Amino acid sequence: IIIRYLVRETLKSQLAILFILLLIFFCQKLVRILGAAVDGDIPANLVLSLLGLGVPEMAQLILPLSLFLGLLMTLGKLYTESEITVMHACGLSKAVLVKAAMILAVFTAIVAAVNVMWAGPWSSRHQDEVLADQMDMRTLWNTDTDRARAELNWRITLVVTVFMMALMVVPLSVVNPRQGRVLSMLPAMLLYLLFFLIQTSLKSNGGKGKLDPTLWMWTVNLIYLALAIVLNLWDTVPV
Amino acid sequence: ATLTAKNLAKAYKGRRVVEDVSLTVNSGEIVGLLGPNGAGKTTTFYMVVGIVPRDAGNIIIDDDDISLLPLHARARRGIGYLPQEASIFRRLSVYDNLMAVLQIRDDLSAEQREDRANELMEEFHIEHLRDSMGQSLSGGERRRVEIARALAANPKFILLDEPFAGVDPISVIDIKRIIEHLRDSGLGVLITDHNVRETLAVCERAYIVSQGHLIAHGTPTEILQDEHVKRVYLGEDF
Amino acid sequence: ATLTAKNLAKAYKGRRVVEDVSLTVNSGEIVGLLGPNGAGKTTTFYMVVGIVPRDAGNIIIDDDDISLLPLHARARRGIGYLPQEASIFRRLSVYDNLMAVLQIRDDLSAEQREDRANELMEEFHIEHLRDSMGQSLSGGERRRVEIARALAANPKFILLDEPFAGVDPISVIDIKRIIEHLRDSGLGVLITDHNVRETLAVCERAYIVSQGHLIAHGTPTEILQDEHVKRVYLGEDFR
Amino acid sequence: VLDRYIGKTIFTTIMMTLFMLVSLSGIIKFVDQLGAGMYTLLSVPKDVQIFFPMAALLGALLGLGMLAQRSELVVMQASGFTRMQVALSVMKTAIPLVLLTMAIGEWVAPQGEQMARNYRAQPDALSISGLHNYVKYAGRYQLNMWSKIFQPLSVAVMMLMALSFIFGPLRSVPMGVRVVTGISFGFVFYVLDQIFGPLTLVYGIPPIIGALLPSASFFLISLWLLMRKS
Amino acid sequence: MSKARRWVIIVLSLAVLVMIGINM
Ligand SMILES: CCCCCCCCCCCCCC(=O)O[C@H](CCCCCCCCCCC)CC(=O)O[C@@H]1[C@@H](NC(=O)C[C@@H](CCCCCCCCCCC)OC(=O)CCCCCCCCCCC)[C@H](OC[C@H](CO)O[C@H](OP(=O)(O)O)[C@@H](COC(=O)C[C@H](O)CCCCCCCCCCC)NC(=O)C[C@H](O)CCCCCCCCCCC)O[C@H](COC)[C@H]1OP(=O)(O)O
Ligand SMILES: CCCCCCCCCCC1=C(C)C(=O)C(OC)=C(OC)C1=O
Ligand SMILES: CCCCCCCCCCC1=C(C)C(=O)C(OC)=C(OC)C1=O
Numbered sequence: 028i029i030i031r032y033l034v035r036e037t038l039k040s041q042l043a044i045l046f047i048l049l050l051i052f053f054c055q056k057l058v059r060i061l062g063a064a065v066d067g068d069i070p071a072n073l074v075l076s077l078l079g080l081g082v083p084e085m086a087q088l089i090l091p092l093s094l095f096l097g098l099l100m101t102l103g104k105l106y107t108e109s110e111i112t113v114m115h116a117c118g119l120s121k122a123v124l125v126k127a128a129m130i131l132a133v134f135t136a137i138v139a140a141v142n143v144m145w146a147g148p149w150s151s152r153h154q155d156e157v158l159a160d161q162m163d164m165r166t167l168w169n170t171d172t173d174r175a176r177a178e179l180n181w182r183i184t185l186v187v188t189v190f191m192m193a194l195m196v197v198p199l200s201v202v203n204p205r206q207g208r209v210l211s212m213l214p215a216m217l218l219y220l221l222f223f224l225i226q227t228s229l230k231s232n233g234g235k236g237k238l239d240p241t242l243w244m245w246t247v248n249l250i251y252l253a254l255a256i257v258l259n260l261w262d263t264v265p266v
Numbered sequence: 267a268t269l270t271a272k273n274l275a276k277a278y279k280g281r282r283v284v285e286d287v288s289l290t291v292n293s294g295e296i297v298g299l300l301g302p303n304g305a306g307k308t309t310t311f312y313m314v315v316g317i318v319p320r321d322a323g324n325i326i327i328d329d330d331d332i333s334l335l336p337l338h339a340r341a342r343r344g345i346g347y348l349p350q351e352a353s354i355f356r357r358l359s360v361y362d363n364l365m366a367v368l369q370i371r372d373d374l375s376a377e378q379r380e381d382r383a384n385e386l387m388e389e390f391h392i393e394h395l396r397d398s399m400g401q402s403l404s405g406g407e408r409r410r411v412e413i414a415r416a417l418a419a420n421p422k423f424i425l426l427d428e429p430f431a432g433v434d435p436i437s438v439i440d441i442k443r444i445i446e447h448l449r450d451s452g453l454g455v456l457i458t459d460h461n462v463r464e465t466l467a468v469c470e471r472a473y474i475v476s477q478g479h480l481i482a483h484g485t486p487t488e489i490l491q492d493e494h495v496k497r498v499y500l501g502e503d504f
Numbered sequence: 505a506t507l508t509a510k511n512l513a514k515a516y517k518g519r520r521v522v523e524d525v526s527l528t529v530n531s532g533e534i535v536g537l538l539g540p541n542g543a544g545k546t547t548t549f550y551m552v553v554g555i556v557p558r559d560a561g562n563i564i565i566d567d568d569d570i571s572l573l574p575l576h577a578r579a580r581r582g583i584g585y586l587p588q589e590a591s592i593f594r595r596l597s598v599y600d601n602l603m604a605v606l607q608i609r610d611d612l613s614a615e616q617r618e619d620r621a622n623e624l625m626e627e628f629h630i631e632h633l634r635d636s637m638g639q640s641l642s643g644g645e646r647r648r649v650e651i652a653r654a655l656a657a658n659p660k661f662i663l664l665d666e667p668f669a670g671v672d673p674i675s676v677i678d679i680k681r682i683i684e685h686l687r688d689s690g691l692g693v694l695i696t697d698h699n700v701r702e703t704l705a706v707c708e709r710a711y712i713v714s715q716g717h718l719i720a721h722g723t724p725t726e727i728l729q730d731e732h733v734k735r736v737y738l739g740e741d742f743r
Numbered sequence: 744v745l746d747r748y749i750g751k752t753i754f755t756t757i758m759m760t761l762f763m764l765v766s767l768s769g770i771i772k773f774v775d776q777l778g779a780g781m782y783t784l785l786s787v788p789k790d791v792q793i794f795f796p797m798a799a800l801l802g803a804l805l806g807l808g809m810l811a812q813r814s815e816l817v818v819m820q821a822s823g824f825t826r827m828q829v830a831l832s833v834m835k836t837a838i839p840l841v842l843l844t845m846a847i848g849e850w851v852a853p854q855g856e857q858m859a860r861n862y863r864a865q866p867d868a869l870s871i872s873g874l875h876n877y878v879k880y881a882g883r884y885q886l887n888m889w890s891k892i893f894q895p896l897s898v899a900v901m902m903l904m905a906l907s908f909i910f911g912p913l914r915s916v917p918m919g920v921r922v923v924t925g926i927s928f929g930f931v932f933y934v935l936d937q938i939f940g941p942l943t944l945v946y947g948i949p950p951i952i953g954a955l956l957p958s959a960s961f962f963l964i965s966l967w968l969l970m971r972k973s
Numbered sequence: 974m975s976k977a978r979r980w981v982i983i984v985l986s987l988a989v990l991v992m993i994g995i996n997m
Binding site: 553554555574575576577579580584585587589590591592593594595596600603604605607608609650653654656657 | 744745748752813814815817818819820821822823824825826
């Protein structure tokens with residue numbers, strides 16, 4: 028009952044971020060592609076379909092972000108409304124908050140696993156034909172067992188990041204009334220943003236052949252997963 | 267039971283906000299904790315609850331030291347807490363947020379959860395609101411649901427934080443009726459607030475902690491006749 | 505002078521929260537405005553101050569209708585407002601607090617304000633503090649400089665919003681001493697506190713409203729021996 | 744005097760936000776090593792020219808918002824002050840701000856940026872006077888003149904806008920919501936500058952007023968939030 | 974707000990500004 032309440036309350040806040048953040052990403056997709064069609068190709072037959080076919084690429088970044096941000100909105104609201112303090116006062120641990128986050132990251136990581144194979148390569152096997160080897164945007168997951176810049180390590184880490192960014196927000200959405208409620212999101216929002224600035228500069232920097240994206244792309248995934256666990260098990264004897 | 271708190275202390279950035287406060291409360295006894303707003307009564311109250319960690323001291327609930335335990339671990343061993351502000355579960359039914367904390371008790375069977383829930387609505391006159399969720403609930407009817415579901419966790423020592431907090435004087439008759447009803451069920455109530463005139467009417471004894479340490483304790487008759495209290499607090503009370 | 509409201513009404517959405525509340529504040533008179541919470545004793549207070557705009561009322565100081573005016577044009581006719589928060593000018597001196605509002609009055613010459621300020625700050629015994637700012641002054645001078653500052657704007661009808669409001673009973677005697685001194689200078693004052701034990705002990709008339717309108721407008725010893733206030737409000741035991 | 748106290752509180756937080764926004768984008772501008780090349784130090788007064796209409800909005804939302812949350816914005820208008828002569832006190836501290844973003848955008852940011860690009864030798868952005876009577880022989884190079892001559896006018900518009908929704912719908916919000924709004928409306932001003940920049944010549948015909956639409960459309964929101972909602 | 978919570982937001986946002994300067 029108290030787990031179905033936390034899931035139903037975050038899901039209404041997660042589907043409201045996915046509509047606001049979709050228009051924010053549409054306008055960034057509209058600011059750019061005018062500038063490649065105002066002194067480039069003609070914006071008469073493509074400007075409404077080139078916008079709508081780059082959606083499963085931009086949904087790779089807003090499906091982990093809306094569950095991250097939707098749990099900061101929902102858990103941060105119940106801390107200020109004194110619903111989580113009185114939840115511990117009747118007696119039940121923070122494992123209810125973790126068992127409600129991972130039962131909700133499963134709902135997102137099976138949309139972000141349908142989007143990452145045969146819904147993502149489809150919109151690059153259709154967006155690059157209307158303009159008429161080493162591409163790695165139209166190959167599916169089985170035929171991505173080539174050599175030489177086969178970047179499936181960035182298509183797997185977009186599904187593991189749904190689980191390790193749902194573990195980090197249950198101890199980082201503790202609202203302190205003295206700091207405020209937006210000042211308390213700052214160690215969380217900077218930690219998610221630092222994760223995507225490292226993996227983007229390891230996918231492209233590892234695409235030239237400067238450092239292989241198996242050692243260094245899963246070291247960051249395991250440093251951040253081990254950070255998710257010490258933060259969640261901090262209430263014990265000193266170590 | 268005999269919840270005892272011994273030699274408690276705290277320092278916020280070097281400032282000694284409380285030194286050597288020792289208070290006990292037994293089962294079936296209203297006990298108050300009041301005094302001026304110099305840090306005092308609030309940090310001492312939030313050590314027995316557990317949402318402020320102590321610097322030095324001991325909390326024991328009659329047999330065993332629970333001073334190093336969080337709030338959810340003290341709630342399994344007795345101690346039950348009511349926040350001052352509105353803490354009812356928001357988009358949940360009144361029967362649902364009574365059952366949500368009645369589901370965590372593993373010493374019951376799933377039919378005894380339903381018998382206890384219908385026993386708690388009729389005890390607090392709530393049973394005409396079981397499908398109605400909150401935010402259709404008034405100020406006096408939200409308060410009965412919070413005490414009915416703090417009693418669903420089966421506590422000893424419900425300790426209330428400012429249970430008056432701004433209510434009209436016909437609504438202090440009904441709060442003090444269900445506070446004296448918990449005492450008649452064998453629960454040791456510990457109250458702190460600002461309103462002096464309405465807790466010294468309901469408490470059997472009271473601790474006055476002012477400027478750090480504890481300055482007096484006793485029955486509310488001999489509290490009023492005390493002279494060291496009378497200077498820093500209660501000049502010409504009644 | 506006399507400040508009178510007449511047939512005040514206010515409706516947000518369907519439910520009229522105020523209907524036909526008429527009060528009268530004469531000079532040299534504490535008068536209270538009381539009732540249960542949410543009944544409309546704090547809406548019919550702000551309708552006299554000027555924050556909440558009226559719907560059908562007539563706010564009148566002795567010969568001018570001020571029911572259409574905002575708060576700043578109402579404060580020049582002789583209405584003073586003391587909010588229940590701190591509201592002292594923090595990073596500004598305690599002599600410059602009085603000089604801040606003494607420069608607004610256009611009937612004082614530029615040297616005639618620096619002896620009116622030097623007169624107000626010794627009547628209220630706040631002359632030993634002269635450069636202490638106000639972000640750390642006291643609790644006892646976050647209530648007495650603001651009265652000297654609200655008196656420096658030359659009011660006739662100073663309106664106190666929740667004066668007692670969570671102070672110790674050793675400090676209630678001090679802020680009751682400066683309300684009775686406030687009307688010894690010929691100044692009608694309206695109080696709207698919730699702690700109805702001293703705002704019936706400092707006042708001479710009271711204006712119990714409950715859920716839309718007036719119930720009683722007698723002396724405090726006339727409301728205890730009433731009957732209809734004793735069912736929606738105080739109870740059956742107040743002595 | 745407290746005309747000199749509203750203005751002193753605002754001016755301190757404009758220059759505190761602007762020093763923050765320049766130090767942030769100076770460590771990002773430490774990109775050109777990818778060892779003691781001070782390219783980012785002589786390009787400081789160009790960064791001051793770029794972040795000044797945004798530090799004006801964010802710094803005045805932060806300085807008036809702390810006057811409102813300390814309740815000293817209603818206690819001076821309940822003792823006098825009209826809402827016009829508190830608006831006139833944030834314009835009296837806007838004239839030294841306008842006389843600084845056109846005094847360094849013509850004397851310092853020309854000669855500082857050019858002497859850095861020459862030191863790093865291992866839209867013809869020169870000046871408002873250098874581009875004046877430069878191109879004769881319609882195109883793009885005149886829009887860089889109009890988006891630079893009343894770039895100081897966009898500072899006074901954003902200080903008026905940061906006051907229009909302090910009296911409007913941000914007087915009783917927490918302080919973090921005002922900062923998030925100040926960043927979000929600093930994103931819209933980027934969008935209106937680079938999407939009304941080209942498109943007002945290539946898919947339409949504003950000759951001069953195409954550079955006005957960033958400032959003219961944020962002036963209409965300012966007089967809609969204090970007049971129609973009053 | 975603290976001594977260790979403040980010194981995280983200084984250090985963690987210093988590494989974001991370095992990582993923005995890396996991929997530009
Ligand atoms: C309410 C909702 C509204 C809608 C919101 C949604 C829609 C938004 C739509 C538009 C989105 C962006 C589209 C885009 O597409 O942005 C693209 C790239 C995608 C960017 C998406 C960015 C925004 C966020 C999206 C999500 C939002 C929710 C680039 C482009 O398009 O530009 C690309 C261009 N780079 C940039 O501009 C920097 C480029 C940097 C990009 C980083 C990308 C990775 C970002 C991760 C961000 C995570 C955020 C959480 O970021 C930019 O653009 C960003 C521009 C907006 C900044 C807004 C303020 C940010 C800070 C706020 C305060 C903290 C690049 O480098 C050239 C290199 C700079 O060193 O030199 C330039 O000049 P110079 O050196 O010659 O002088 C650059 C110089 O440096 C500089 O100014 C100095 C710094 O670096 C500036 C850095 C940015 C500001 C930082 C401030 C501190 C921030 C701290 C933050 C913690 N200077 C300019 O360009 C002039 C502009 O005035 C700068 C404007 C900066 C903002 C303030 C002023 C606004 C205008 C004036 C008002 C008066 O070359 C490319 C190829 O061409 C050859 C070119 O194109 P292309 O992409 O086509 O290849
Ligand atoms: C807690 C931070 C966000 C606060 C939003 C206002 C919260 C307090 C009133 C909430 C509320 C509303 C509005 C409400 O409409 C309702 O219905 C059953 C509630 O039920 C218990 C509520 O708690
Ligand atoms: C362009 C600037 C936009 C600023 C937008 C701020 C939006 C704040 C929304 C706050 C909010 C949250 C989080 C929220 O969760 C909620 O309800 C469940 C609200 O209900 C009325 C809210 O208002």
